[PDB]
């Protein structure tokens, strides 16, 4: 792969905030970015050098994108893998459709991660309604109480149903329209972390520090880096697990692997995203090379960047709920951005979305400081200010 050098066109399938941040990283290095996204008001399409407003399966637009761009990547884990393979007919596509197909499918994902030598949650695969009917109650009960999760198309905790007994499993599967699912045992979690790596076509790789992640209602709330409760041994183990997965997958791009640390201290892989990840947004303000710049470098065959963290960091997600301090049934209130910007540690990132809605990711604030405790205090003060915490 002769390197694709600055000045070239790079393609981005998906136009959310991840694609928008990719644009800034690519444009700062002198690349031009074409974003393919069906939405008029796409956050990435808004800043891209070119916006192809098209469905992800539109043949003419994929052909146009691959003709224009020397390399293409994605910011959308649920993108059709067949679209990436169609693009790969005429341009370089990083990560490959086959890699995305594994990562986007919980059944394939658990099988692949386990096959890499990495522990996953105890679970039962439910391939179909007919297959579930053939499973006896005891087989389900071994992983109960648990969570029934659709194998495809889930995000932000959607497509997941809590289940406490076999009858609830069968009713839940009908409630999910019978799609392939994984039934996972609910595990006693002590904390959650994510490993963030980038891998080049050559097999060279880089690793970020471990991120410690807190979720609210299944949605990422904040990230603390370096993970304060992860020993150097656990950090190395989680990084090595992510690199082993990426190596076996032949992955080229940025990969994020989420893990649980259980109350007994064991490390359990949860899932992986074939793309930059919300838990990696801190790298923009805290590390020499951001995850978005690694995505540029991997897809162009350029050398991977240094991951040095120059500053401890906390990322706080900003959901649309912040706009409804008097509840969702009452008028929106513009958040107090002037008071956020008055905090020395605060790095405000707003995605340009017009309509605040509850559950919608509207931006994030990174807090960097000389010490982690100062960044954490600042993130806590801002969370109270925004009514994220009491
Ligand atoms: N087996 C489990 N045991 C305990 N908690 C779990 C389990 N599976 C998921 N959770 C909790 O639910 C959160 C969301 O689950 P999961 O990662 O499967 O959903 P998602 O929609 O794919 O994720 P994301 O929030 O990254 O889009 C996990 O971070 C964890 O807090
Ligand atoms: Mg996944
Ligand atoms: Mg997750």
TrEMBL record:
Residues 110-300 form the ATP-grasp domain. Transmembrane segments: none annotated. InterPro entries: ATP-grasp, ATP-grasp_carboxylate-amine, ATP_grasp_subdomain_1, PreATP-grasp_dom_sf, PurK, PurK_C, PurT/PurK_preATP-grasp, Rudment_hybrid_motif. It is an enzyme of class 6 (ligase). GO terms for cellular component: cytosol. GO terms for molecular function: 5-(carboxyamino)imidazole ribonucleotide synthase activity; ATP binding; metal ion binding; phosphoribosylaminoimidazole carboxylase activity. Its EC number is 6.3.4.18. It catalyses: 5-amino-1-(5-phospho-beta-D-ribosyl)imidazole + hydrogencarbonate + ATP = 5-carboxyamino-1-(5-phospho-D-ribosyl)imidazole + ADP + phosphate + 2 H(+). Homodimer. HAMAP family: PurK. Catalyzes the ATP-dependent conversion of 5-aminoimidazole ribonucleotide (AIR) and HCO(3)- to N5-carboxyaminoimidazole ribonucleotide (N5-CAIR). This is N5-carboxyaminoimidazole ribonucleotide synthase. It comes from Paraburkholderia xenovorans (strain LB400). The gene is purK.
């Amino acid at each position: 792969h002769s390197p694709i050098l600055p000045g070239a066109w790079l393609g981005m399938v998906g136009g959310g905030q991840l694609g928008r941040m990719f644009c800034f990283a690519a444009q700062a290095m002198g690349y031009r970015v074409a974003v393919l996204d069906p939405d008029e008001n796409s956050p990435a399409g808004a800043v891209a050098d070119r916006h192809l407003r098209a469905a992800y399966n539109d043949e003419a637009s994929l052909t146009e994108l691959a003709r224009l761009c020397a390399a293409v990547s994605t910011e959308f884990e649920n993108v059709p893998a067949a679209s990436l393979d169609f693009l790969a007919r005429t341009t370089f596509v990083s990560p490959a459709g086959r890699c995305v197909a594994v990562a986007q499918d919980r059944i394939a994902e658990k099988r692949f991660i386990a096959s890499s030598g990495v522990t996953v949650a105890p679970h039962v695969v439910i391939e179909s309604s007919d297959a579930l009917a053939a499973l006896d109650d005891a087989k389900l009960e071994a992983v109960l109480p648990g969570i029934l999760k659709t194998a495809r198309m889930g995000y932000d905790g959607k497509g997941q149903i809590r289940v406490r007994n076999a009858e609830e499993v069968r009713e839940a599967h009908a409630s999910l329209a019978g799609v392939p699912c994984v039934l996972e045992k609910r595990l006693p979690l002590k904390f959650e972390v994510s490993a963030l790596i980038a891998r080049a076509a050559s097999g060279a790789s880089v690793v970020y520090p471990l991120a410690q992640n807190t979720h609210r209602d299944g949605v990422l709330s904040h990230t603390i880096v370096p993970a304060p409760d992860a020993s150097p041994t656990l950090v190395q183990q989680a990084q090595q697990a992510a690199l082993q997965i990426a190596d076996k997958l032949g992955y080229v791009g940025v990969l994020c692997v989420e893990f649980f640390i259980l109350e007994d201290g064991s490390l359990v892989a949860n899932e992986m995203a074939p793309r930059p990840h919300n838990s990696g947004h801190y790298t923009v303000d805290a590390c020499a090379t951001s995850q978005f710049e690694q995505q540029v470098r991997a897809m162009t065959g350029m050398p991977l960047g240094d991951t040095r963290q120059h500053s401890p960091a906390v990322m706080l997600n900003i959901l649309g709920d912040v706009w409804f301090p008097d509840g969702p049934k009452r008028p929106a209130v513009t958040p107090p951005w002037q008071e956020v910007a008055a905090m020395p540690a605060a790095r405000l990132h707003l995605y340009g979305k017009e309509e605040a809605r509850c559950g919608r990711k509207m931006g994030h604030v990174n807090f960097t400081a000389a010490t982690l405790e100062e960044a954490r205090t600042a993130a806590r003060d801002c969370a109270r200010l925004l009514h994220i915490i009491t």
